[PDB]
Amino acid sequence: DLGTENLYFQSNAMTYLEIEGTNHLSGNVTISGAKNAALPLIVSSILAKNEVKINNVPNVADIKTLISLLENLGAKVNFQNNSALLNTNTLNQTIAKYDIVRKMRASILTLGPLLARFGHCEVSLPGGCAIGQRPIDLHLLALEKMGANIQIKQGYVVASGNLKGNEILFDKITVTGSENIIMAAALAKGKTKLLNVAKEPEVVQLCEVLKDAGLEIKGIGTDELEIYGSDGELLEFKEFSVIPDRIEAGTYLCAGAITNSKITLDKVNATHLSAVLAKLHQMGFETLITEDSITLLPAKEIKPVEIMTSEYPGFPTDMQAQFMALALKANGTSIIDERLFENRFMHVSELLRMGADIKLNGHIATIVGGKELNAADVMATDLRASSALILAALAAKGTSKVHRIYHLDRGYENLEEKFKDLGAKITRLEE
């Protein structure tokens, strides 16, 4: 999911965003291709005997890193105008100790395809693996069910053996684990049956592409897949476009709502935002869909909302912060119920400095909307929190300053240009 280290804290070379508030918005914003779909779709070219064409690919750091890793392993690549060309005919793995760190982070997606196609694969134990403990993120248990022999012998995890189909149960709903095992099953011998499979549109596209490429797969879109493996034979890929970034789209919608403004989104799929559109409706905003486009209409009054995060197709945790920001304008008390898994409320402290009335009680945030928000100097954290602070700034009185935008820039390309075209008064300055 993430392609580099904790460079967030390195604030010697850095920039920040200055945003003036209380400006009505207007116009159109084109939604980019989903970063989380593109990553597994690029890793999937490991399964293609021919040239793979992929369109609507966001030009972000993680995409570039992945492409460069495949080049280092022999793949012939090209990437321009959000379109990539992949050919893994010459792909070969390198000696366990070559591109060490790059291969360790990408192993959550590449481990499966590489072990399946090439019969073996080595990944380095991260720092923090006490004698014995194997990485639980890799789905090592899953691959063992498919006949893989796994061992820890020189500071690395060494997987080997020919993969065969089997019934595999996911201990928890995992987007990357699903994608990693879907690609392993694709080349294994015989039929694989996956249970408790993530239903996210990103997983669905992966399956659709493989199906379109000749693989027998049933249950697409459900939590239970049946895959008839090609028994080592690579597939004939066909050109396709990466799906629109539903989170990015959700965030532009909240920008239109929090400023209580008419705006329109292009190159967007409403079917992937069901839960989000329903909540915007619960808050008084009418939605209007015309295939690849969505238009948001202002509300008479912004009404409070109750949100509980869950796995797709429920309300996405990746939109929780943007809705907390919008709930600040609602005429009444809102409630947001989150999962105690990876902070998730990093944006709260910074909103308090903008005069927000927010109280945390364990995993549940109570928002008392109505107060006028005041501008402030805020420190952004993850992508999620970063989106929320920009939204709050657009509705607050005065000029705000959003610092530490490292996670935001690695998540979205031309972010200023899009807000600028919608009429927002945003400018980047040197820290």
Q: For residue 314, what are its two tokens?
A: 């429920």
Only one residue has tokens 């947001």, namely: 336
Question: From the CB of 217, what's the least distance to Cl ion, in Å?
Answer: 7
By the rule CB under 8 A, 410 interacts with its own copies: yes
Q: Site residues for its own copies, window 117-146 (CB under 8 A)?
A: 124-138, 140-141, 145
3-state helix, strand, coil in the chain (%, to 5): 35, 25, 40
CA-CA distance, 359 to 120, in Å (whole number)?
51
> Nearest 5°: phi and psi at 158?
-115, 115
Find which of Cl ion, its own copies, none residue 178 binds, CB within 5 to 8 Å per kind. Answer: none
> Nearest 5°: phi and psi at 300?
-70, -55
Find which of its own copies, Cl ion, none residue 220 binds, CB within 5 to 8 Å per kind. Answer: Cl ion
Give the residue among 430, 360, 427 at the shortest CA–CA distance from 390. 427
CA-CA distance, 318 to 202, in Å (whole number)?
14
Question: From the CB of 214, what's the least distance to its own copies, in Å?
Answer: 30
Return the SS3 of 378.
Answer: strand
Annotated binding site for UDP-N-acetyl-alpha-D-glucosamine, which residues?
Answer: 105, 134-138, 318, 340
> In the complex, which residues of this chain contact Cl ion (CB under 5 A)?
218, 220
CA angle 369, 370, 373 (to 5 degrees): 90
Q: Which residue is nearest to Cl ion (CB)?
A: 220
By the rule CB under 8 A, 80 interacts with its own copies: no
CA-CA distance, 72 to 183, in Å (whole number)?
21
Amino acid at 249: A
Q: Site residues for its own copies, window 290-329 (CB under 8 A)?
A: 310-311
Between 214 and 314, name the residue whose CB sits nearer to its own copies. 314
Between 10 and 68, name the residue whose CB sits nearer to its own copies. 10
Between 92 and 132, name the residue whose CB sits nearer to its own copies. 132
Q: Site residues for its own copies, window 326-365 (CB under 8 A)?
A: 339-346, 348-349, 352, 360-363
Choosing from 91, 108, 209, 296, the residue that interacts with its own copies (CB under 8 A) is 108
By the rule CB under 8 A, 45 interacts with its own copies: no
Between 388 and 422, name the residue whose CB sits nearer to its own copies. 388
CA-CA distance, 385 to 225, in Å (whole number)?
34
Instruction: Tell me, by CB under 8 A, how many residues bind its own copies.
Output: 71
Using left for φ > 0, alpha for ψ between -120 and 50, and beta otherwise, residue 59 falls in: beta
Between 75 and 182, name the residue whose CB sits nearer to Cl ion. 182
Q: Site residues for its own copies, window 368-397 (CB under 8 A)?
A: 379, 381-382
| Buried residues in 12-23 as b, exposed as e (16+ CB within 10 A) | eeeebbebbbeb
**Using an 8 Å Cβ cutoff, are 407 and 11 in contact?**
no
Question: From the CB of 38, what's the least distance to its own copies, in Å?
Answer: 17
Q: Which of 121, 129, 207, 254 is catalytic?
A: 129
Strands 333-337 and 364-368 turn out to be antiparallel
Q: For residue 247, what are its two tokens?
A: 């989170």
By the rule CB under 8 A, 105 interacts with its own copies: yes
Between 77 and 173, name the residue whose CB sits nearer to its own copies. 173
Annotated binding site, which residues?
Answer: 35-36, 105, 134-138, 318, 340
Residue 129 annotated to the active site: yes
By the rule CB under 8 A, 429 interacts with its own copies: no
Question: From the CB of 157, what's the least distance to its own copies, in Å?
Answer: 9
Neighbour count for residue 278 (Cβ, 10 Å) = 11
Find which of its own copies, Cl ion, none residue 371 binds, CB within 5 to 8 Å per kind. Answer: none
Neighbour count for residue 153 (Cβ, 10 Å) = 8
Q: Active-site residue numbers?
A: 129
